[PDB]
Tab-separated table of N, CA, C and O in Angstrom:
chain	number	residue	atom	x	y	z
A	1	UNK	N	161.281	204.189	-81.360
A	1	UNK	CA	160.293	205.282	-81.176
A	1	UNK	C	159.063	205.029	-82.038
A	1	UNK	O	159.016	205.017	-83.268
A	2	UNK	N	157.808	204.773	-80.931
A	2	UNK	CA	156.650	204.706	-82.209
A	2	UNK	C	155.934	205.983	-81.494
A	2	UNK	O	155.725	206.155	-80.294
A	3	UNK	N	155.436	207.319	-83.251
A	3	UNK	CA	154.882	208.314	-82.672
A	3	UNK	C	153.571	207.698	-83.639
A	3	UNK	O	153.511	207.273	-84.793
A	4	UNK	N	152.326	207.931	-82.268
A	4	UNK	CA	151.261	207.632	-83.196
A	4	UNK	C	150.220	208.348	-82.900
A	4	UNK	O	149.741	208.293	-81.767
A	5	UNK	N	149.659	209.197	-83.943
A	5	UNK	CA	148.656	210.499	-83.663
A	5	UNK	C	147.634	210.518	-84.069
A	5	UNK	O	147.627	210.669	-85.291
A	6	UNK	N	146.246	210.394	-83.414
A	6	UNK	CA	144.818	209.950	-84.251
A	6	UNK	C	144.263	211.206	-83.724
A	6	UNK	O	143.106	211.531	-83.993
């Protein structure tokens, strides 16, 4: 799981 938030 990749969580990625910009």
């Amino acid at each position: 799981l990749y969580i990625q938030w910009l």
